[PDB]
Amino acid sequence: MKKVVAVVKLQLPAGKATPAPPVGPALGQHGANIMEFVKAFNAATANMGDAIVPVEITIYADRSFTFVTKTPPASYLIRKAAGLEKGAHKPGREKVGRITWEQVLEIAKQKMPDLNTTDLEAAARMIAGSARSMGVEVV
Template sequence: MSKAVSRLRMAKKTGEKVIHGPKMRMTVPAGMATPGPPLGPVLGQRGVNVAQFCKEFNERTQDIKEMIPIPTRVTVHPDRSFSIEITQPPVTYFLKQAAGIPRGTMFPGRDIVGKVTLKHIYEIAMIKSQDRANQLCTLEELCKRIIGTARTVGIEVVKGDLDPKEHGEFLERTREFVEKQLQELREQREAKVLRT
């Protein structure tokens, strides 16, 4: 009996010494880092000074428009200090901005909810080429990746320019279509709640 108790105590001691990986990836809105959830608890678990992180992140993103999603990598050092690597916003953010849509499609490959030109793709590739992860890629490779991402979001890439009038009409039809889909989703969720 005493061997079992000592093993249990030993297991408890080793179980308390969980060491998390030193790197974290998260997306934080520019200039909006706060010590509250969800950011505060995640950083606090790793022993990071949350107030210091928020201050440093907000200072480094003060020149960026608020609420733009910023992919952030945090490396926690053994002495509980940290370093922050901030990259450009995600490709999907730029694509939705260029297409003038608030969200992508719920059914990739089936619905087209926006349109962008090859010029937009090139400009996004130029911006994303500044990220450390993309520095070894050629612009052609980046453009191909961005076109692939556009397809998954439901954005069509067109050659040439978009006619503003036709594009405006397309966006209006798309807004109505997306609103109808969202309404169907709300009704499905409400039906599930009523069944349970």
């Protein structure tokens, strides 16, 4: 019972949001309070740090907003194991590091209420099948 006119999807670094783009254009369009979001975003993500954080802004007809903070990218959390330099490229022909099958047994419960899976079973195979596009291994 408050009309939504925008669900804006946006990836932002923890505690380092500013009026500047993407934020300016993304909220200014729908008359959302910009300074207000910057201040609220930053305080919300102050407990994490340097983490990339996906965030959904629900903008209403009165120009109100709420926002939901996400998990963040599976790929960020993978290379929290071996985060050496820049990642791979667009086709996929670059090396970085590696891991094994006991990272998922912690990080798939964190990344759970995103891509919906009630059973613990499939959660393994998605992270193992994400550790490929950057140059990662599982054995």
